[PDB]
């Protein structure tokens, strides 16, 4: 939920998209969390070693 007034001026000053910069950090953030999840299950589901 970015803004319509943003992409007007941001793209004017910085030339950035301001959409694919958000779409790029959401699509990445779900792929990181899904990946942090299993490695947080393995260490959650792992027996206590050296026991």
């Amino acid at each position: 939920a970015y803004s319509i007034e943003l992409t007007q001026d941001l793209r004017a000053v910085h030339g950035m998209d301001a959409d694919a910069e958000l779409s790029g950090i959401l699509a990445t953030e779900i792929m990181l969390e899904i990946n942090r999840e299993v490695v947080d299950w393995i260490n959650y589901s792992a027996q206590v070693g050296k026991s």
Binding site: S3, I4, E5, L6
Partner: protein, 51 residues
């Protein structure tokens, strides 16, 4: 006498950006315009003489 002068100005893009409930803001609707279309009705009146 110049005490009370007459101006016209625009909307600060901090306000204009979020207008009618964006980013959680409230109570600030946009202005709107309609049109009306009413009607008038006339009637012919007679007139006459004799000899």
């Amino acid at each position: 006498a110049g005490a009370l002068v007459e101006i016209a100005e625009g909307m600060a893009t901090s306000i204009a950006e979020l207008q009618e409930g964006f980013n959680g803001s409230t109570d600030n609707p946009w202005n709107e315009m309609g049109f009306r279309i009413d009607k008038q009705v006339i009637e012919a009146k007679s007139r006459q003489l004799k000899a």
